[PDB]
Design an enzyme around this catalytic site. Sequence first.
Site, mmCIF file in Angstrom:
data_model
loop_
_atom_site.group_PDB
_atom_site.id
_atom_site.type_symbol
_atom_site.label_atom_id
_atom_site.label_comp_id
_atom_site.label_asym_id
_atom_site.label_seq_id
_atom_site.Cartn_x
_atom_site.Cartn_y
_atom_site.Cartn_z
ATOM 1 N N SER A 92 0.823 -1.204 0.000
ATOM 2 C CA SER A 92 0.000 0.000 0.000
ATOM 3 C C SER A 92 0.858 1.254 0.000
ATOM 4 C CB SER A 92 -0.944 0.027 1.199
ATOM 5 O OG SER A 92 -1.977 0.994 1.006
ATOM 6 N N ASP A 98 -1.517 1.348 -4.091
ATOM 7 C CA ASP A 98 -2.388 0.334 -4.670
ATOM 8 C C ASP A 98 -3.741 0.906 -5.024
ATOM 9 O OD1 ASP A 98 -3.075 0.666 -1.948
ATOM 10 O OD2 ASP A 98 -3.288 -1.459 -1.588
ATOM 11 N N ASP A 111 -3.086 6.501 -3.159
ATOM 12 C CA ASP A 111 -2.015 5.728 -2.556
ATOM 13 C C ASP A 111 -1.543 4.665 -3.560
ATOM 14 O OD1 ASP A 111 -4.127 3.867 -2.341
ATOM 15 O OD2 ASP A 111 -3.508 3.201 -0.358
ATOM 16 N N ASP A 119 -6.384 1.958 -3.578
ATOM 17 C CA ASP A 119 -7.668 1.769 -2.930
ATOM 18 C C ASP A 119 -8.075 2.968 -2.077
ATOM 19 O OD1 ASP A 119 -5.677 1.268 -1.066
ATOM 20 O OD2 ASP A 119 -6.655 -0.531 -0.262
HETATM 21 MG MG LIG Z 1 -3.985 1.283 -0.131
#
Ligand SMILES: [Mg+2]
Length: 448
Positions: free
Chosen positions: A97, A239, A237, A241
């Site tokens: 992440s 990744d 961020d 999400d």
């Molecule tokens: Mg994330």
Amino acid sequence: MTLPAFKAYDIRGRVPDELNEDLARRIGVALAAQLDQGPVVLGHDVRLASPALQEALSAGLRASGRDVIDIGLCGTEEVYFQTDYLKAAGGVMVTASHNPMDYNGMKLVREQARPISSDTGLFAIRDTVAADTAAPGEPTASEQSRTDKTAYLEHLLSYVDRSTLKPLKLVVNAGNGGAGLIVDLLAPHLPFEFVRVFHEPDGNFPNGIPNPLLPENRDATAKAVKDNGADFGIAWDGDFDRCFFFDHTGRFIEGYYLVGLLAQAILAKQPGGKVVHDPRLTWNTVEQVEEAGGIPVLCKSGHAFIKEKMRSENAVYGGEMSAHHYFREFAYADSGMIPWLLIAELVSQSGRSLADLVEARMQKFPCSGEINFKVADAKASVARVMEHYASLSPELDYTDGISADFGQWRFNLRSSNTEPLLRLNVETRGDAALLETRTQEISNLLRG
Ligand SMILES: [Mg+2]
Ligand SMILES: O=P(O)(O)O[C@H]1O[C@H](CO)[C@@H](O)[C@H](O)[C@@H]1O
């Protein structure tokens, strides 16, 4: 001891001592024994170590007779979507992440992208991995490569009426994470003019690790917005999400206000629906959801509680102040893409700036932001605060830490489930002075 990499909601650790290919393969073997029947979706983020970590996960899974669907380099939300769309038994995202560069990890789900957490299988997996000395078996199942994003992209686009979109000028900042690939794939289907900042995926992160909450990283998106006269800016961020919004003035929008904004956006499509929200900051969400004809549903903060509650409630949308937005139609999972499509549609249809869409709400319900304390004694510190405010007789709710409603102001004080930390949120009824004095008062008590 136990393996430190296994946390409350996911696996996160420094490579190679806390997480490595051998642990990853062992996790694949243990995960096979936890799921219902079916294949397993695997995906990974831009970090340099992630492909090899996914490859070991695959080897362990197929050694246990699990067919693997390799969807390749992707966002965490693509593992959620594809696990659910392909009716897989489960899925794993290899991602750090936003952690430092020597870190990596995994996010695990079972059928319908339901989370696998410490108390719903993840620690079971940990203990199996911790005691597994067996020799690596050999593969008895296959890997399929499935990189087609068509179904995912069509699903993203289905949230908005594309003929009502205006040619907004949007700054997009992938932070050299993975969001840029999805932006560029959506772009031919959208009228917006994109201003791409830190766009190319680079696992060395030449511009810093993808964390839009760092003021240094925040400022690159703000500057691009201001310098290009953009309608707003979006950062993700690593990744992607989580997404983060900057209005036309370059101002970062505190995530609390996006819950009520996005709920109203959604409730115009799915009238009368239920909207799940966390207990940290509440008053604005409750009012905006009710004003939009929806039903607000209070729920303990944390993504697995939110999703479980959304399911039991058939809630159309759940939102957390900390930049997590979940969507029933998206397998009840979080997306960093759906929120900005919704926002861009709202700006386009309404003719109002993102700034004006939130400005009155921020004046009506000023909040402190989430303020964290590492203190010698959390329990004693919390007792000090409750003791100090006892004479005022607040209305108390213990859904998630302590919430105290004093009438014109309220706070929530929680122990973090992912960090040994006290977390404080304060908001008031249109009173910035009361907000500051109470926030400072509570801070001194906690630090005492
Ligand atoms: Mg994330
Ligand atoms: O305060 P906590 O317990 O450490 O939880 C935080 O991280 C969770 C997972 O990202 C989120 O789901 C939470 O909402 C919050 O951002």
